[PDB]
Amino acid sequence: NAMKKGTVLNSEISSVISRLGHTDTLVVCDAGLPIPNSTARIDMALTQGVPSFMQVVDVVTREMQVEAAILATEIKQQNPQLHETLLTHLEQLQQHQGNTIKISYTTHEQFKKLTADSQAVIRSGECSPYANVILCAGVT
Amino acid sequence: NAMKKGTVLNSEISSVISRLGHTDTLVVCDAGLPIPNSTARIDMALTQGVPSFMQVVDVVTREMQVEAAILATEIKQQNPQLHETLLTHLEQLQQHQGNTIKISYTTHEQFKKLTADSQAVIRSGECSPYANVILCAGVTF
Amino acid sequence: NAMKKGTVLNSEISSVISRLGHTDTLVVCDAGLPIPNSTARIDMALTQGVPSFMQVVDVVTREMQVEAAILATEIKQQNPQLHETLLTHLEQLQQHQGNTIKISYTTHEQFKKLTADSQAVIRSGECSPYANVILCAGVTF
Amino acid sequence: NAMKKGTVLNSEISSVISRLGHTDTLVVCDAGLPIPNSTARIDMALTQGVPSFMQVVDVVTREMQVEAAILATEIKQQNPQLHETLLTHLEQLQQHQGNTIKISYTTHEQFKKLTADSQAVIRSGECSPYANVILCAGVT
Amino acid sequence: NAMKKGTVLNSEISSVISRLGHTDTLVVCDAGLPIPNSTARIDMALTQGVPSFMQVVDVVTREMQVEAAILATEIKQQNPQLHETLLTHLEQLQQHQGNTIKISYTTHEQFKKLTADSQAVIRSGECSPYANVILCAGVT
Amino acid sequence: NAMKKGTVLNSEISSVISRLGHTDTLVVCDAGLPIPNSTARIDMALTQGVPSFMQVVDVVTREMQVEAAILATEIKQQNPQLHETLLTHLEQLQQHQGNTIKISYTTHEQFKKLTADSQAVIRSGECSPYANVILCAGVTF
Amino acid sequence: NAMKKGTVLNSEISSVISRLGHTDTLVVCDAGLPIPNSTARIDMALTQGVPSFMQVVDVVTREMQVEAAILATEIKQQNPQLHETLLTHLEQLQQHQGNTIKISYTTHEQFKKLTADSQAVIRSGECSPYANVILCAGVT
Amino acid sequence: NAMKKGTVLNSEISSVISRLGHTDTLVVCDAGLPIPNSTARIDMALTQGVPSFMQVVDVVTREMQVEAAILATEIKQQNPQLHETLLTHLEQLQQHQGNTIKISYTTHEQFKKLTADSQAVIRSGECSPYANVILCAGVTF
Amino acid sequence: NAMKKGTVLNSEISSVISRLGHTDTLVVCDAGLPIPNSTARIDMALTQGVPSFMQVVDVVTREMQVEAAILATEIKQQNPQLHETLLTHLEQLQQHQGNTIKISYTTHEQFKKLTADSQAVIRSGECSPYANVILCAGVTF
Amino acid sequence: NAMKKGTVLNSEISSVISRLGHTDTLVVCDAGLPIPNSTARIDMALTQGVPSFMQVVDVVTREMQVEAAILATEIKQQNPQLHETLLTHLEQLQQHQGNTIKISYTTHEQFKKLTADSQAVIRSGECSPYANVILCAGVTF
């Protein structure tokens, strides 16, 4: 029913993804992450759990070439279920892309600082803890 | 997880609902409706069916006082399931509000013209046909 | 090499196509068409023939659902080779879309007026005559 | 009579609260506090005492999840009545929120510097001395 | 405590009043009135009843020279108490101004149209019905 | 004749005075002072001597609560008449305000730097030398 | 003491005069004239009587070539002293310019409508009645 | 077919070239280069390989006086065919200009940093690796 | 000495010319013409007679393809020397363009109205009367 | 013919000169000088030699009070004829101003840095080398 072919329908998300170059980053975050004013805010949160973190990550990565992902170390202990789903998804993504997506971890404080350098933060409705990822653009 | 208490979390939706006065309109539309440039565009559409038309209508009407809804005539025959889900929702809403929500139908052509006068169009990921409603703000005195 | 998957790489074209609704129009024009200030100008012209009219039409239609195309009557006599190439392309596009693209003709003067209502005019490097088309967004339901 | 359900009716206050993330701050101030140009100015002051500092704090905290509050040390000695009323209110808020709101004190000079980092300063009509608080967003 | 001498403390209200010329209008409205986009929106509403319609009218008229007031005919029957309070206040204002303030009534529909031509609409927290007035600037 | 009651009639001056908080500064300057772009420019200068430095200082201080004033050292020797008229005015102002206005002096070079931090510079038509003052907002608690 | 040679010192007035072409108009008005938003507002009013209407007209006409002036008919009866001073000044101006300045009169209502088409309205501190003129740019 | 005489038809390119002074830089880049926000973005990329890096470099240099070019060292080993075509083109350009165009190499990391100081980056559709050049404006005088 | 090759050096002129399409107009005017706010203002006037009307017309027409020119009837009687110099110049221009430039006349009142529809007015320092021309973009095709 | 009396007819030049205070600078430059984006760009260049550097300096100084001028040391050897013309002009200007204009020299690299602090750079059509000057506003008291 959209006039745009494909599945990435949001106008802002389409626009920012089409502006990305190598090493530019894009953040997908949860309903409580602060968003620095040095970065564009794309607020997709409708209500609790809608859309979910994974729904957004999944849709964004259909159009974005990802070479790396950064996470808060706190996700491992405090949201292991979501951590594992994300890792599985990034594993499938890299296979589809024909590359290898590098995963790394920093403290959440440091994560928030890195968000200041992204091209945009896409806010989801996710309510679970530390459901935030920085995606880095890259191709082989 | 959010810093705003309640369930209407979107910043633009909150902002526009808080600016509404009596008889101001807000449109919730499907993935294919054109949006006139005389109106603000709030693009919630992520992908096909996410978020749905009903998810957006429901969330919006938790904060918005609704006195009327306008629909395309075309929805009756071409999307009867969604039509009846929306009518049921508006029926519950009016009860919770303590009023009676007036429903009307115009041609889709005329509907699109009315959208030019709204304060904003909130775009959903809905892909079914004629999944568009104009909500009118109002309360009992 | 581009960070966007697919083949529609231009940021402004991607942006306008993602904002299109049903019956919105998008114009692809040649190097000499005047562009009204009521419409956004996406200037893809690099130099004579680069990119060609057909390159731009082809790329735009890989993302945009097209239900109709409008052309100046003058193209039939004054640019028949390009006219046919475009018709063949629209024939294949409708097949891949699963619909039927309606083609219509107006005077060039009328065509220029219709461009004032489009969302954007994407300017190619094409130098042949009347190499301009208005594409209308639409899908079947 | 308003078209928005609830009691937080101001359009600008609604807007900024809806934009808050964890650790973002919002300031509620008196009629005399300077407002840095690195922050948004929401001027609610109508006239002396209208609306009061407490009326604004109260209304803001109906929508905002508060995890901490910062005050000038000067409030203790120079506006003890208002100091107490605020502490009692924050006590009731934390109970309603199911958390514990941390209170801390800085010099007024330092307080003014922290206001430079807030998302907005909401100016009240309060005329008593040092009737200024920085509220920090947070949940569990 | 404010740095501006007097009692009209709001920065936006001060600003618009200082821009008024003869026959320019300023609207003071209730919490439910729609505000046309051809006019500036000064949103003073904090919460239900704060500030009241009368508090705003009173404060605005301390700085503004008023020669006329326009009301919806609906106020007469549906908010007679507020109607009277306003007429008494306008009576005292004209005495203090040394002029005579003309009052007239239009349909609410027509009232809303006239608001499109005003310099600003100052929104109060008033919840009673038809608590809206158009004030017209003028002196002798 | 004006629609604003009182005697501070300028729209920009009214606007900026109403935005002032404690320790914010406002500068009233002469016809030749440079105005940094980090500060708002309110240009009241019509022609030589119109309005005068004192006319502007006087009007501004009818609405502004002043707790301090800063001057160039150079004003003492090079514009002593104006210096003493200003000191007299500040003396009356403090009495009417019920406080005590603190006066200080810096080099003109340093004065210009301090103007970079003010909320606005109100430019007068004054042509005498070093007819510039930084006024600091403040009241007694 | 100004860096600009000559006597027209205001930055906005200098700017608008330098943009004028033949038949463009510029209004000088009193402290109470409403100023339409279709026109630029240059607010020179400091306080009652400062600067005066004549001070502004006089300064503006040192840089502006004037071919015509329009006045409200009401000036003749209600501000004859100022009317005559203005006429005398326009008489001297035309002699200096080597042309003949055309004077015409319309109703004040019509005058206000004509102000909507000017390039700018320069507001003086004048408090006497109908102290408003539309100046038309022109040279022989 | 265009209203501008000559062969540099793009309005943004024409505009930026006409604002260049001596030592100003202009970047022509491939489809994958990040573009810093301290620089203007001129997005000519339509689709993969259209227009090519060389098409853009060639057209730009028909209006722009070039005194030097900077490349990433990585181009030597990872895009040698394109490297050579560019050097040949710069050789012919310097001859038609009557000067000598200086070529230098930096790491790609350092190249990206230099792009932050250019007046604009013109993005081509090129997909080969390290197809990025910083062109420096200058004339013999 | 400039970084742009050729002789049309102004950045705004270069910019506007590169955006012209067929039938777009560009005005070159004298020091006294009013410029409507519906049109871009390019102020080249430095002082009386610098640059002259003819200097501007000449430079503009080196980049701009002209198909027609409109003048005020008043130029015939009140600036005949300039009228003739312009016609001669348009005669030589059409020869170098290989077309025929149509000249027409309207009242000056009507001329001013047409200027409201141009893409820009380029103001020269010319002081002679009615030294104003509307140039229409076009090429033979 | 112009509606402004006097000889400084350009709207942007008039505007910037009227905003100058003591020690603010204004640059007049040649056709090749790069203009930093921290400064306003007033592009008076029409074509080679039009207007000349001296035309622009002369006109600017009819309105602007000048207390000092800064030049690149390179002008002495590489443009001695223009250097002398400028010095003679500054000699007459100071006489008519009743002051003494201080002239100083820096490296051209340093000159370019100083331009970043000016209020505006007014670009002439001058093609000779190092035809750039920084003028400093000031009057005697």
- Write the DSSP string, J56-106: HHHHHHHHB-EEEEEEETHHHHH-HHHHHHHHHHHHHHHHHHTS--EEEEE
The count of domains in chain B is 1
Element (H, E) at I106: strand I102-106
Rounded to whole angstroms, the Cα distance separating E11 from D43 reads 7
In whole angstroms, what is the distance from residue C61 CA to residue C88 CA? 13
E41 contacts B21? CB cut-off 8 A: no
Query: Strands, DSSP E only, in C3-132?
Result: 25-29, 40-43, 66-72, 102-106, 120-123
Does F4 fall in a domain? no
Residue in D31, D44, D46 closest to E1 by CB: D31
Please, which chains are in contact with E (at least 3 CB pairs closer than 8 A)? Answer: B, D, F, G
CA nearest to J139 within chain G: G1
Residue G1 inside a domain? The answer is no
Using alpha carbons, select from D15, D59, D137, A31 the residue that is nearest to residue B11: D15
> Is residue F24 helix, strand or coil?
coil
| Chain E residues in contact with B20 (beta carbon < 8 A) | 34
H or E element at residue F108: helix F108-115
Any idea what the Cα angle at residue F62 is, between residues F59 and F66, rounded to 5°?
110
B132 is known to lie in a ligand binding site: yes
Instruction: Let me know the angle formed at the C-alpha of B104 by B98 and B106, rounded to the nearest 5 degrees.
Output: 160
Tokens of J28: 């007049």
For I14, other C-beta atoms within 10 Å of its C-beta total 25
The answer to whether position G41 is within a domain reads yes
Scanning every residue of chain C, which has its alpha carbon at the shortest distance from the alpha carbon of B32?
A: C21
What residues contact J87, with CB distance under 8 A and at least 6 apart? J103
User: Which residues of chain A make contact with C137, given a CB cutoff of 8 A?
Assistant: 3
Q: How near does any CA of chain F get to the CA of G41, in Å?
A: 10
Of I5, I18, I20, the CB nearest to H65: I5
The Cα–Cα gap between F19 and D115 comes to: 16
Residue that is written with structure tokens 């004006």 in the block: F2
**Phi (first) and psi of residue I25, to 5 degrees:** -120, 155
B105 annotated to a ligand binding site: no
Best mutation target among C16, C23, C26 (most B Cβ atoms within 10 Å) is C23
Residue of A62, A67, A79 lying closest to A104 (CA atoms): A67
Question: What count of CB pairs under 8 Å joins H to J?
Answer: 16
Note whether residue G128 is domain-resident.
yes
Please tell me the distance from the alpha carbon of residue A120 to that of residue E62, in angstroms, as a whole number: 47
**Which residues partner with F123 through β-bridges?**
F29, F43
Q: In 10 A of CB D87, how many CB atoms?
A: 13
Is E128 part of a structural domain of the chain? Answer: yes
Q: Do chains I and C touch (3 or more CB pairs under 8 A)?
A: yes
The amino acid that residue I100 corresponds to is T
Residues in chain I: 141
CB-based contacts of F77: which residues, under 8 Å, 6+ apart? none
Instruction: Determine whether G96 is exposed, middle or buried from the number of CB atoms within 10 Å of its CB (0-12, 13-18, 19+).
Output: exposed
Question: Is residue B77 classed exposed, middle or buried when 0-12, 13-18 and 19+ CB atoms within 10 A define those classes?
Answer: exposed
Instruction: Kindly determine whether residue J22 and residue F35, on different chains, have CB atoms separated by under 8 Å.
Output: no
D13: its two tokens? 């206050």
Question: Is residue E123 one of the residues assigned to a domain?
Answer: yes
- Comparing alpha-carbon positions, the chain D residue that sits nearest to F21 is D34
> Under a CB-based contact definition with an 8 Å cutoff, are residues H123 and H43 in contact?
yes
Method: X-ray
Tokens of I140: 């033979």
The answer to whether the bond into I51 is cis (omega within 30° of 0) is: yes
Q: What is the DSSP string of chain A?
A: --SBSSS---HHHHHHHHH--TT-EEEEE-TT----TTSEEEE---BTTBS-HHHHHHHHHHHB-EEEEEEETHHHHH-HHHHHHHHHHHHHHHHHHTS--EEEEE-HHHHHHHHTTSSEEEE----STT--EEEEE---
How close does chain G come to F21, measured CA to CA in Å?
22
Domain membership of residue H37 (yes or no) is: yes
How distant is the Cα of F111 from the closest Cα of chain J, in angstroms?
13
3-state secondary structure of E122: strand
Chain A: closest CA distance from residue B103 (Å): 25
- For C38, residues 6+ apart whose C-beta sits below 8 A from its C-beta are C116, C117
Q: Are G35 and G120 in contact (CB under 8 A)?
A: no
Task: Give me the catalytic one of I22, I83, I89, I96.
Answer: I22
B3 contacts D138 by C-beta, under 8 angstroms: yes
Domain extent for B23: 10-138
β-strands G25-29, G120-123: how paired? parallel
**From chain A, which residues contact D within 8 Å (Cβ)?**
32-35, 41
Contacting residues of H for I10, CB less than 8 Å apart? 18
Question: In this structure, which amino acid lies at residue H108?
Answer: H
d(CA I120, CA I26): 5
Asked whether residue F53 is assigned to any structural domain, the reply reads: yes
- Which residue does chain I place closest to J30, by CA atoms? I1
Helix (H) or strand (E) holding D56: helix D53-63
**Whole-number Å distance between alpha carbons of A47 and B60:** 10
CB contact under 8 A, I21 and C41: no
- Write down the residue that tokens 């009866």 correspond to: G77
Q: Hey, are the CB atoms on B33 and C24 less than 8 Å from each other? A: no
Query: What is the C-alpha R_g of chain E?
Result: 14
Q: Using CA coordinates, name the residue in chain D closest to E60.
A: D46
Inter-chain touch D139–A35, beta carbons under 8 Å: no
**Cα–Cα distance for residue pair C101/C117, rounded to 1 Å:** 20
Largest Cα separation within chain A, whole Å, is: 43
Touching subunits for chain H (3+ Cβ pairs under 8 A): A, C, I, J
Catalytic residues of C: 22
Sign (positive or negative) of CA dihedral E26, E32, E37, E40: positive
Per the structure block, which two tokens stand in for D70?
A: 């910062």
Closest alpha carbon to A102 in A75, A138, A57: A138
Eight-state DSSP code of residue H83:
H
The CATH number for C46's domain is: 3.40.1650.10
- Contact list in C for residue A17 (CB cut-off 8 A) is 3-4, 14
Rounded to a whole number of angstroms, the distance from the CA of J141 to the nearest CA of chain I is 30
Q: How far apart are CA D1 and CA E132, in angstroms?
A: 13
Q: Given 3-state DSSP classes, what are the helix, strand and coil percentages for chain I, each rounded to the nearest 5?
A: 35, 25, 40
β-pair partners for J64: G4
